[PDB]
Ligand binder design. Structure first.
Ligand SMILES: Nc1nc2c(ncn2[C@@H]2O[C@H](COP(=O)(O)OP(=O)(O)OP(=O)(O)O)[C@@H](O)[C@H]2O)c(=O)[nH]1
Ligand SMILES: Nc1nc2c(ncn2[C@@H]2O[C@H](COP(=O)(O)OP(=O)(O)OP(=O)(O)O)[C@@H](O)[C@H]2O)c(=O)[nH]1
Ligand SMILES: Nc1nc2c(ncn2[C@@H]2O[C@H](COP(=O)(O)OP(=O)(O)OP(=O)(O)O)[C@@H](O)[C@H]2O)c(=O)[nH]1
Ligand SMILES: Nc1nc2c(ncn2[C@@H]2O[C@H](COP(=O)(O)OP(=O)(O)OP(=O)(O)O)[C@@H](O)[C@H]2O)c(=O)[nH]1
Ligand SMILES: Nc1nc2c(ncn2[C@@H]2O[C@H](COP(=O)(O)OP(=O)(O)OP(=O)(O)O)[C@@H](O)[C@H]2O)c(=O)[nH]1
Ligand SMILES: Nc1nc2c(ncn2[C@@H]2O[C@H](COP(=O)(O)OP(=O)(O)OP(=O)(O)O)[C@@H](O)[C@H]2O)c(=O)[nH]1
Lengths: 149, 146, 146, 149, 147, 147
């Protein structure tokens, strides 16, 4: 019984309210930005589709992250705004639940997939786009307690 | 209006894509990682496999993305001690009417998310940064690089 | 803005939902079905199982739908010769902050789609009609019926 | 080797261009209609979300329909309009591909799930809503050839 | 030494085929339940035969380094062998691609077996899935292979 | 007689646990490949052990009448037994719910085995998955059960 892959046993940990908020950014290029403001490259609105994709991702997290716990989610929010001046798209997501485990991954993942979704909705205009700074901003509940960046 | 771009008209040509991602480590992260993980298993070994799997699940995560038959997938996950970084690279190949830039980008992203998952117990200040396309080729498009 | 409705605040109460669907048959469909299918297997046996499975996959099909632990699923698939109809009914139960009307509606819909798949070789004029909620109960909501 | 469930062998059938178009309707009630025109019951725009859900469904078809063939899809279109006067929401989808098998199910399924999605986006306003007349409108390619309702 | 999905880009898409089987040893209690039609959960074999077909289609999702594949065909047969008190599962999967379908056929049986077990464990938790093996395969380089 | 997901609504959510194992018979060629680190696809056991964990989480998706479940824990161990020329797989799954986790544990091993097979079939297509059985289970009504 060495240090090998395993899903930590949290059977005896209580069922407390958990939450987590994350964010991701997408660095745009002129062409990219030009298209976005024109409504996309013909596939639909990048932000609208990516926003829904980010929510769906939150629900598929345990399917993408190997040692992650399957959890019923009680809430999922996702914001996908365009920071016109900075040439950036900003995604932020907040997930909530009632289980023995946290939801930092459901939050982190929601942001990464919505980021990938914006990329797919605009790579035809420019493939140099970059997804940057995907990071956690807060979480609460359980034992660790509150946390903010 | 949203929609999956019709490509029935185009032919099956070889397609290849290569991307990469970075996870910025905190000493607390790098120390755990080096001692074998935070107690959940080698963070990198798990990230790499999760990356190959993410490439296979791409079309089910990216809404307008085209379902394709992956013909090859490589994923590299390496620790850069001096840089306090985890570098991830993925190459996806296929034969179809569309590129695999998503599969590659997705493989890197999810691998990164897995590095985060295997180390966040040591630090939640970990940052996934620069998931970007390095190389791509095939069909009409042609060559392209960072 | 789209979003999965926060219910962390509410308690886990028993929840139940019952829906149904109909597939209008053409003589060409009913004749195949009665002879055992169009050659792919009992259309109804397959529809019923597909329905139970659809109930389990609901949250992955309905975007804002809440992930829940299903605690029970019943699906009935019956031929109504005189009516040239296929009647489908599904009841889903659970214990959580939200109802299972989707699971039940989804179970019926997909079962219906399966009846169509097992018979369309005989007729593509088959119609899925009236997928609707029959009964529902649990928590704040209370009773409700067609 | 009797008449039991099986995925028909189409290995020796050629790879021809296939297409299929289907449609589904959702009968609304006043409350339902009132909310839809007001932008939904708080979860987002029913038509916008259902439209994306219908596309995604098209890709999960083989996962929902037991004896259905796994196929690379080459195209997917979905229309989700509100027929204000008839108190109906009309969904229509068209799928395309290049394989030995048709895509009538990818089309039928896209419509049924988008219908379910509109239901979920409005059941809070009225649960009496009904999904009706999900049917095929056309298909082409392969052997059967053209077909229209 | 690291894991990966083998590059088969330059290989030609041909007719591939694989056939594997699986066995489920039945205890007397479980066999009796099977003959009565199951523990009231449903018909063990009927449900299992379907689980195998669906299974085969989810193969690439369960085997990490497996290649995703459009399947041209899937055949599954689940039978009872009273005398040996065993359930037998045979599956033949067919495709046109650069890689074989041994995994789809192999997984088809394993999961079908797992389903027999689920449908009867209420009677005997000790039931065993005894033999999941490849019987035949064909297509491409190595050509026809037989057990 | 029709199939269905058994109603367990009125049962209490308790600590459930199940442990099952699986074996993979190795031919001399395959064993040799295993000791060298595999056929160049990656480390058979490492990859398999992960496939089992993921597998267990996809259980409800593969077994038709199975109950979906939040899993509190999943343990998988994959070892080589040179002398018997066998790979052994043990999996223990844990949850808090109205139903047992025998399927999650049972499927964890079967799929892990299927993965060993995938990682080594290049060397020997004849490798066999010989024994997938339940070793222990606990929680609820029947309580502790042992092979
Ligand atoms: N400006 C420009 N637009 C393009 C080009 N190719 C396609 N488009 C537009 O963008 C859409 C295609 O999106 P892409 O991301 O390039 O390809 P895709 O196959 O749709 O998406 P994936 O399956 O995720 O790879 C088309 O329907 C057009 O609306 C191009 O070369 N230049
Ligand atoms: N260094 C360190 N390790 C911890 C700490 N808390 C838990 N661990 C270790 O890491 C494991 C928990 O991993 P987490 O990612 O925090 O939680 P998890 O539920 O296992 O993982 P998720 O389901 O992905 O959220 C424990 O079983 C220990 O092995 C901590 O505060 N510091
Ligand atoms: N008018 C009205 N609106 C409600 C009621 N309950 C919830 N809502 C609104 O509708 C949203 C909830 O949608 P519902 O479909 O009822 O429940 P849900 O859990 O979000 O959706 P499912 O997980 O698919 O069952 C809330 O966020 C509010 O915006 C209600 O009782 N009356
Ligand atoms: N009565 C009748 N049966 C047909 C016809 N064509 C095919 N069949 C039978 O039905 C099977 C084909 O089913 P289809 O649904 O048309 O095609 P499929 O590829 O098997 O099914 P999908 O993947 O869901 O599209 C054949 O293998 C025969 O068993 C037809 O024109 N009339
Ligand atoms: N010794 C031996 N090695 C082989 C043979 N064929 C392929 N290999 C090696 O094993 C790898 C191929 O693995 P396989 O499992 O046969 O095929 P695969 O397509 O990669 O795997 P699947 O998609 O799961 O079928 C090659 O990249 C080589 O490293 C063979 O016939 N004999
Ligand atoms: N003979 C016998 N039958 C049982 C027992 N427990 C349950 N049953 C019967 O089998 C059904 C339960 O099936 P199980 O497989 O034990 O449990 P399950 O939760 O339905 O199935 P899973 O979700 O796959 O674990 C009940 O509805 C009864 O029909 C038992 O202990 N002995």
């Amino acid at each position: 019984q060495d240090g090998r892959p395993r899903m930590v046993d949290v059977t005896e940990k209580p069922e407390t309210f958990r939450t987590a908020t994350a964010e991701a950014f997408v660095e745009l290029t002129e062409e990219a930005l030009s298209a976005l403001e024109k409504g996309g490259v013909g596939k639909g609105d990048p932000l609208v589709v990516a926003q829904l994709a980010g929510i769906l991702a939150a629900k598929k997290t345990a399917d993408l992250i190997p040692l992650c716990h399957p959890l019923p989610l009680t809430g999922v929010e996702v914001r996908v705004e365009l920071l016109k001046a900075e040439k950036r798209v900003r995604i932020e997501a907040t997930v909530k639940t009632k289980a023995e485990t946290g939801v930092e991954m459901e939050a982190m993942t929601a942001c990464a997939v919505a980021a990938l979704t914006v990329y797919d909705m605009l790579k035809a205009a420019s493939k140099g786009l970059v997804i940057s700074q995907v990071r956690l901003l807060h979480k609460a509940g359980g034992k660790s307690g509150e946390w903010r960046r």
